[PDB]
Amino acid sequence: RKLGYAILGLGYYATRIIMPRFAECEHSRLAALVSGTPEKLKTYGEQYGIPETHRYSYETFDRIIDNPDVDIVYVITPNSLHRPFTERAARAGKHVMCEKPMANTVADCEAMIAACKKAGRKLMIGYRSRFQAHNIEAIKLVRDGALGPVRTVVTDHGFTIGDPKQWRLNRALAGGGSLMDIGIYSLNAARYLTGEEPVAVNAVESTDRSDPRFGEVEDIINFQLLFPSGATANCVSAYSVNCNRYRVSGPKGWVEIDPATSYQGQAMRAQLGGPPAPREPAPQPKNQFSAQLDHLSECILTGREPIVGGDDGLKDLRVIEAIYRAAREGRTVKL
């Protein structure tokens, strides 16, 4: 049994990364395209053999309720449009896969969760690293007690951004700067490595507002998290350095991945009561993208809830609001 996906927003991630990976899926297929660019519907429709009946503009999208080949809409647009497209997908009786960050605010996430709940449809956020081999290995080592209690998580995510005119540098479409786009990987990782939610937050922003890229959103905002167990995290979020990594440590040892949450190339090193050494994770059947896609499909088919549901995206937005507040007010924000 395969469930049908409509991909909405035919941009870089949708067309270069997600859509090719349906080939390795076991319970998911590409069934429809939704796009504000007529030329894209033709090109990708013809390339993937999607009939004109299964091609939608943003103005014909609501008619997708009548298409039984579509079970899931995967929203892959600029951040500020996640909420409205998610609401309309739910209104058309479809389950929803929504990219990160879930939405611009906590209230927006709550609205999305409520809309899907009212429609009796499932909602999943695209945290693919939860389906990536090295990340799974790290999470399980922590849970199995290989490190003892988690004491520190040190995680850095950033890339040197370019073109000042792109939507990520537009506050109205992005919702915020590096933290919304890439720093959220540091946050999401601190949360799934500890298996906890933070109770206190520090942050510091560093942005040159005279830079053509950063008139509206932040460049660097680094943050500290304290968790109930006493676990701590130091996190980097940046648009002016390239980094992608974490190390989680306890009294019995540590494990790190660098790059940690990239499309490919993950490399893990561990120190588990002996000398530091490379560590291969347990093999996974399918790549992280195909796994993410099937996870939602399998959840629908078996009546389970996704391991990264709308509530996971909401929990990230909760801390992100606190991070922004801490950097703005120059104080520890309690949660």
Place this chain on the structure above:
Amino acid sequence: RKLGYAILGLGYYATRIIMPRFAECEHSRLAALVSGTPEKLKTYGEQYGIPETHRYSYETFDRIIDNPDVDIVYVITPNSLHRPFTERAARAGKHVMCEKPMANTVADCEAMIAACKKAGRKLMIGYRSRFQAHNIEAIKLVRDGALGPVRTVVTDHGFTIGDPKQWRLNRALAGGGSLMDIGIYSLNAARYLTGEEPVAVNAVESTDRSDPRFGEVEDIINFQLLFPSGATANCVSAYSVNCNRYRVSGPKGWVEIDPATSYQGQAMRAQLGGPPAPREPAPQPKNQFSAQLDHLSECILTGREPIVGGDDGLKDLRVIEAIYRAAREGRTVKL
């Protein structure tokens, strides 16, 4: 050609690490011993061929003023004793090498600097990493602009401390916990890699007071630094995990060392003109310990000021006070 050292405080660092390294010095020799343990004066005096006239107790130490073979006193005691021995050494007409952390407070550091200034003698703090090949290479890469403007420094220093009864876990003798002992390497590195002094500080402490080790001083205290250029640092200081590293990054690339400030075993990796790769540093004439020792001697011989004088130790204690305050008050402390 060789200035004479008196080693004061014959503990682990003095006897196992420093004393064997006079072997490779070019301008420094072991001339005297100062100890509160008569047996140690016998053992090491006989081992290093130090005449009985050149052996002192803490009670007879001030007599060293009449020993022309002693030019320098190297204070290697618990932290709370750095100030009184440094002041006595200065009044005995000796130049002073003082181990980190310089002293317990800013005020203590100021008094030490004043004492040595009044005596017309030089003062140097034992930041051996400034004479270590990989560290020198990292600094040079930053100063040469290889990374562009420094944007982030991520640095973690900690070890799993053992015996609860040792002086490092006693507030009266240590002045504080992991930050005083090992976290100061994270701080000092942030300062010498940026070449700057911090203007804002965040911190979070995490300590299990039920642990027999931490009834008096802190286990984890992680901190954030903001510098005038906009450079930032995320720092870990810990007594319950093992880490020793830093990565400094800018828009053009990054360089890291792991382990960074260890006695031996430094390994550097950099991402500059291509993907991350190992990088061997330019060679240094002698090991970091002999080089530190000879640096003070040479400064005295040539009438120059040490690259890590009392003011460098003071500048660290200034940020340490702020870090402790930031953690206690839950706010960004400005400097």
